[PDB]
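User: I'm putting together a teaching handout on how multi-component assemblies are represented. Below are the sequence lines for each component of a complex, exactly as they appear in our records. Could you produce the 3D structure of the whole assembly as structure tokens, so the students can see both representations side by side? Please keep the chain order the same as the input.
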Amino acid sequence: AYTNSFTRGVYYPDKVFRSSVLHSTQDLFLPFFSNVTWFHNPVLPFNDGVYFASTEKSNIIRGWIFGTTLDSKTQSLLIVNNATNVVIKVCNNCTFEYVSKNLREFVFKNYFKIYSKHTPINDLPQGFSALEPLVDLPIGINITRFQTLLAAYYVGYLQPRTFLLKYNENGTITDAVDCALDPLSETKCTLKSFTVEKGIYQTSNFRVQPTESIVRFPNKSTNLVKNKCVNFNFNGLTGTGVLTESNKKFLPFQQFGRDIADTTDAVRDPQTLEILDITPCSFGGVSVITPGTNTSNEVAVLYQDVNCTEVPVAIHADQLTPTWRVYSTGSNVFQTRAGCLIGAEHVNNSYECDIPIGAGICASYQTSQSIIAYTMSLGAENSVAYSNNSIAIPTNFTISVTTEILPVSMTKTSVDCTMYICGDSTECSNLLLQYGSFCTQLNRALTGIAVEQDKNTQEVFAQVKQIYKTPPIKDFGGFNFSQILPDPSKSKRSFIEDLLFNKVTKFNGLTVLPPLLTDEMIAQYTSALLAGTITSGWTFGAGAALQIPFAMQMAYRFNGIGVTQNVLYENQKLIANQFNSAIGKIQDSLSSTASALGKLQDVVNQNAQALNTLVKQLSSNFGAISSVLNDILSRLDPPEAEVQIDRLITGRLQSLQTYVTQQLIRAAEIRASANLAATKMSECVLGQSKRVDFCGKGYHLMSFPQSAPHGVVFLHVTYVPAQEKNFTTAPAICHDGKAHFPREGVFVSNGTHWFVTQRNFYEPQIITTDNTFVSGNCDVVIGIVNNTVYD
Amino acid sequence: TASALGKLQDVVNQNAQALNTLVKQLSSNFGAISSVLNDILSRLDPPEAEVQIDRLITGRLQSLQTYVTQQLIRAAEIRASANLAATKMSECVLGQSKRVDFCGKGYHLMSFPQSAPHGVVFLHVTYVPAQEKNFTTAPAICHDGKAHFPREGVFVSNGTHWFVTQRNFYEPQIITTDNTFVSGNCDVVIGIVNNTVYD
Amino acid sequence: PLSETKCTLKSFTVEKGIYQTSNFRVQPTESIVRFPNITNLCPFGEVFNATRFASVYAWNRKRISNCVADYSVLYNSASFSTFKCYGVSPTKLNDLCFTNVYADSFVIRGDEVRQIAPGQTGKIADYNYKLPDDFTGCVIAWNSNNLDLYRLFRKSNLKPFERDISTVGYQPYRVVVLSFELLHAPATVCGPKKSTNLVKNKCVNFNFNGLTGTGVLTESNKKFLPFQQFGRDIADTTDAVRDPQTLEILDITPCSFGGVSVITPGTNTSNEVAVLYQDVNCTEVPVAIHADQLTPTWRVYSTGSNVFQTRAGCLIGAEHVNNSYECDIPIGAGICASYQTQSIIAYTMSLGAENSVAYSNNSIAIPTNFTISVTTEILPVSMTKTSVDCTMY
Amino acid sequence: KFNGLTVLPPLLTDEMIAQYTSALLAGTITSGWTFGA
Amino acid sequence: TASALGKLQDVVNQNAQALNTLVKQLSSNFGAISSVLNDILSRLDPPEAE
Ligand SMILES: *[C@@H]1O[C@H](CO)[C@@H](O)[C@H](O)[C@H]1NC(C)=O
Ligand SMILES: *[C@@H]1O[C@H](CO)[C@@H](O)[C@H](O)[C@H]1NC(C)=O
Ligand SMILES: *[C@@H]1O[C@H](CO)[C@@H](O)[C@H](O)[C@H]1NC(C)=O
Ligand SMILES: *[C@@H]1O[C@H](CO)[C@@H](O)[C@H](O)[C@H]1NC(C)=O
Ligand SMILES: *[C@@H]1O[C@H](CO)[C@@H](O)[C@H](O)[C@H]1NC(C)=O
Ligand SMILES: *[C@@H]1O[C@H](CO)[C@@H](O)[C@H](O)[C@H]1NC(C)=O
Ligand SMILES: *[C@@H]1O[C@H](CO)[C@@H](O)[C@H](O)[C@H]1NC(C)=O
Ligand SMILES: *[C@@H]1O[C@H](CO)[C@@H](O)[C@H](O)[C@H]1NC(C)=O
Ligand SMILES: *[C@@H]1O[C@H](CO)[C@@H](O)[C@H](O)[C@H]1NC(C)=O
Ligand SMILES: *[C@@H]1O[C@H](CO)[C@@H](O)[C@H](O)[C@H]1NC(C)=O
Ligand SMILES: *[C@@H]1O[C@H](CO)[C@@H](O)[C@H](O)[C@H]1NC(C)=O
Ligand SMILES: *[C@@H]1O[C@H](CO)[C@@H](O)[C@H](O)[C@H]1NC(C)=O
Ligand SMILES: *[C@@H]1O[C@H](CO)[C@@H](O)[C@H](O)[C@H]1NC(C)=O
Ligand SMILES: *[C@@H]1O[C@H](CO)[C@@H](O)[C@H](O)[C@H]1NC(C)=O
Ligand SMILES: *[C@@H]1O[C@H](CO)[C@@H](O)[C@H](O)[C@H]1NC(C)=O
Ligand SMILES: *[C@@H]1O[C@H](CO)[C@@H](O)[C@H](O)[C@H]1NC(C)=O
Ligand SMILES: *[C@@H]1O[C@H](CO)[C@@H](O)[C@H](O)[C@H]1NC(C)=O
Ligand SMILES: *[C@@H]1O[C@H](CO)[C@@H](O)[C@H](O)[C@H]1NC(C)=O
Ligand SMILES: *[C@@H]1O[C@H](CO)[C@@H](O)[C@H](O)[C@H]1NC(C)=O
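Assistant: Of course. Below is the structure of the complete assembly, with chains in the same order as your input.
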């Protein structure tokens, strides 16, 4: 009888307290969802370590016996528990002695370590319970078999498997992940987290192992094997690859062929005058494609650059868990240009890309729900009804507000060079003094980056000479502006600014310098810019601020984009309502989703990852006897302590140099982004921009700035036509033998009558010498149309 | 003012300091018994001179790599600055720019180039209003039940009379059909006022 | 501080600004050694003075724990021909504390004496007795010709620390190897080091079972399990330690440190400076700046009436001013410093003159005049074409 | 690919890039800047 | 003509040259007595092979 072990049998790997930390350890652990034999007397082998489970209340089981032969000729160990006493012996010829409804778990491993746990239960239960160490017997005995002294118990065997342990605030293990259970758990272990976001993650490395070794010597030699990755040995040079027939013709005195980069590609075998190619056997990456962890646990596996029929072989599929073997076969394979994709159903339909794979292939979690792989769709097919006498003219419009987010600055991290490399060590400092001024160079570069961050922030935000305030009367012609104007009733930031700020959320020589401008000052600058823009248009940026009603400012903007002011003057209420609705939609989207500020989240995550890597680089030996400078100094003499300290110094100096170089490149990127943001605030906010798609999609009317953690957000108010109608158009109108052309507009016809209308809004007008101008005769213009012109 | 050209002097100082650090890096032992190849070779046999020379080679190669990486980053920054300068020469100098604050504060009239050590200097001539006056304004004018809007400018009032003026300079004009156009009626415009339009 | 700034800048003239000159550090005040109170003398007599030693192919092994070893007698004894230690220095045995000791004793020939070392091969060093490449211990060899079997061969080379039993320079030399266990475990075999008292809330140099360090020891409320001896943080660094003599958990906080910046105007203007101690309270500034070991001029910038606590650190030597002006020398968190009536003043930077535009729905401001302004813009274009001959360099 | 070197294919194929450019050309020819606005 | 599209060809050449240099760097001894890992392992002892 076999029973599923669920996820039980996890003990404490070491005696080190940990709290609120995810720690990955490598030791002998019971595999998750394994099979344990159920005995309902028998002698069983020990292997590496034994997990014992008992479900009893009457305490039938009393002890254990361990050994090899269990009858003389060796030492056998024995444990017996009676009443409130426990006796352990290695018996005579005794060399050791020790005296010290219910589910009891025990773990025995070889020094003999015994971990124990006791729980109440009401059929192995489903749950988690860590095992605290209880017994450590200094025996040094070889055990390969054991038996139980007494009616039902479970026996399982431990294996060398890596686990990711989760510690709570009180130091008790709550959850764990078996890194070799399935691709999802491997992804969790690689990400060092229990939650995985949607996407593709490169987790593993796949390589074909050699199957046999062949040696060929000229007249101890073996027979050559073709079409198999083998460990060959021709003459004097060794290698691993696949030997196949080749059409190359070597010269009689030549034995090997080299590629352009000094790489051997063909070899002539010594026994026979034959040339064999050498191709490396398959290798590549193994990536896991998953949706959100809380969405589904289904995953797909992609093996880059491998034939899809050789995936099961050379991946040790037979040596992996049965859970992983699902992702090697199953008639659900798909050979793409990137590689063989297993676990995703191929769909002939095309949708928008969700998770890219390569060569136009995308995967998604769509309909039962399963992973589907398809070819990405470039968009909706369209065909413009083009003709030489038809024009489409809009009759309505929509006011749309879009959002753009740009990073501006970073966190000013300052790394104490000497404290990081040789912290609290005079000998280490003296040894480091021989390396010149690398340390001063690193400090200077970091200081330059820190100053550049403040320069970026000042350039982006400090663009207004004075501080402007909105009047107490907010009669702005129907426009609300209350969502973006500052709220003094509470850090006097606006509602949207608060949403943005809430959306995004010191030792070994590492420090963080505060920015020169505080969030309150940045909010003050943004409020001044908003007040100036609302009250004076672009006059505040051109010079002294000149007040103007907001309706007249919007009329200015429409005239600038090419629409007459009357459109605003008798569509004012509709335009104001559309603007208010757009602002409300922006607020709702910001309050709902959290991926809008991913541009700033990426910068924060990159900086945090770099800092964490720098911190973790201090635990490496770099070839030394230990990674602790104090331990090296207290253990070794100066003649050898110097060598160990030199190794550590070289490693840590290399780590610091790498960190500084990466920080410099990232700072260059952030400075470019800050320059772009400064230009956008100068052009979109302080004026009206005619550049296409610079200040959002559509005809840009205006823009509003907001401050976000280490960045600026632009709300781009634009004009977009909505409904269009067909009309018949003519390049010119012939009235009295002279061609007529419109001053500003197009000629259109509803079927019987001809009018002149503006480009971006349908407004027919009587053709008149005030609307048109005369130029030339009617015999030159192609497509002229006879009509009359009013006078 | 001596510190007017600090942008170019910063580049000069950075390059000079990098070169000075690279030169001073030759005085470091890097773990060897001495920083002089000639002294090492004259004092020691090839078996140990090899170790000393290897230490010196490693140190000096690391110094060169650091210097070259810093120089590459600085060169990329200078290339970005040169591209910006070329764009400014094309737009501000060879034409009139409508971009705000691209060619100086104010309404950019024109610009002049001058040379400087490893740099270019732009003298931006711009227009800036100086003195401003208050006026009463209306969105449109009612004359005969029809709304009149200015062709180019705004309506202003000195207290009793209504004129039409351009945006950036006060120049009152008689409100006529030459500078006003008719569109719509008087019942829809918000804030319309009553006046006369001369024919 | 001004002369220190000059020394760091390698110049006799210092431009106006704030410069990073030196570093802040609190020196330890007390030395703490805490060892278990074990009076059991470690029994090395049964290992060293034993009359009968087993053969080389059946080398005798003994395990030592729960004792206070004294290697000074063995080191000072002249009865040992050679005493070679590899992972630990001979003189640091008296100070270091181990967990377990393995004593392996046998008898070999003088030629094979040199073969008892890591990374060695031979008749005995490869087919009879092996040592790990990272062996940590000491080998003691001495002749016994005046005081008082080799294996031929086998199938292959036995793995280190494995014993298999199946089926002039010629004088006998007794060889005893003491291998120390350095695994992650509570220390058990210590040396004869006298323990001291325990002091808290002080920057001290502690020593818990050989775990050297420096920091401030404070009582913590961590829920340590009975088998847990110490704790680690997110960065895998020691955070709490259990007292070897008392079931008490002590939190370790490293002694205070930070940066020291000097804010000065031009030397042509004034010789007065201000000092900023980054990320530290103003209470610990004088006690750790070594003022009573520094020059009398350095004592001025350690205390005084002009002490300002800012978000960027503690500012000493600058007078706080309620008014706000344009920034002159930045400090952090909106704080700026300047040289004005003169002395160094610290204030909050001003963002500009306040203004309110007289907005209304029927009023417009129109210019009547204008001005023509010419402004200067400077952009770098190129650098110096420097080529360095790497081979000749 | 001999010593751990791999070349990942681009997500967008040459045919897809050509389709983008053809759509842009068709929109420009038959509509002007209205398709972009 | 032939030099019209040199901008893209320069990028291709730079990438190819960088890859070629990276692969070619595997033939250098870097101070060791041999550049072949298998030869070093089969010819030296672990104390020096390390
Ligand atoms: C492992 O256990 C499961 C569940 O009890 C069972 O279905 C399966 O047959 C077992 N495996 C073997 C090899 O018996
Ligand atoms: C324990 O003894 C068995 C029986 O010969 C043997 O096969 C095994 O290798 C031994 N294990 C150890 C660690 O000595
Ligand atoms: C942790 O300890 C605290 C004691 O303050 C207790 O309230 C809490 O329930 C404990 N949590 C767990 C998971 O044991
Ligand atoms: C080597 O010996 C084999 C024996 O069968 C023979 O076939 C082959 O031709 C020989 N090659 C040379 C080069 O002598
Ligand atoms: C996402 O997954 C985490 C992990 O359990 C869960 O706590 C969270 O509620 C999930 N999100 C949603 C919206 O359900
Ligand atoms: C992969 O293996 C199949 C085996 O049927 C073979 O036909 C094919 O040529 C191989 N290569 C590719 C790229 O499919
Ligand atoms: C999917 O499309 C391919 C064309 O490449 C076709 O051969 C196949 O029959 C289609 N499958 C289905 C289920 O329609
Ligand atoms: C334009 O659309 C709005 C709604 O978006 C609608 O209320 C209005 O009536 C439309 N105008 C015309 C002329 O159709
Ligand atoms: C603006 O919108 C708010 C709701 O967001 C509303 O309470 C208010 O009355 C509106 N008008 C003004 C002038 O604030
Ligand atoms: C204009 O006419 C074409 C063809 O008659 C038609 O496809 C198109 O939809 C029409 N436009 C509108 C706005 O209806
Ligand atoms: C448009 O083209 C058609 C031919 O397709 C031609 O008959 C007609 O005259 C043309 N009209 C104009 C206005 O060019
Ligand atoms: C316009 O009138 C307001 C109302 O007090 C005043 O504040 C402002 O200074 C006036 N404008 C000018 C240019 O004087
Ligand atoms: C301006 O607002 C006032 C309300 O205080 C109103 O009476 C007046 O008609 C408005 N004038 C214009 C031109 O909007
Ligand atoms: C006995 O052991 C002691 C160490 O305490 C040593 O000094 C002495 O030489 C030993 N006796 C002999 C005969 O070696
Ligand atoms: C000796 O150490 C024990 C802990 O092992 C402690 O309880 C006891 O108080 C100590 N006694 C003295 C005198 O130090
Ligand atoms: C200091 O400044 C004054 C002008 O205020 C100048 O005359 C003098 O030469 C300067 N000192 C030096 C050493 O240059
Ligand atoms: C000063 O000490 C207090 C507690 O006494 C604590 O906030 C922190 O350690 C220090 N504060 C600052 C701002 O450095
Ligand atoms: C002036 O400074 C003192 C000293 O901190 C402070 O208590 C007081 O509130 C300040 N006065 C004003 C008006 O800020
Ligand atoms: C305009 O300003 C200039 C000086 O810049 C002055 O000479 C001129 O009289 C002013 N004109 C008016 C109308 O105020």
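A couple of points students might notice: Residues 282 and 755 of chain A are 73 Å apart (CA to CA). The longest helix of chain A spans residues 638-685.
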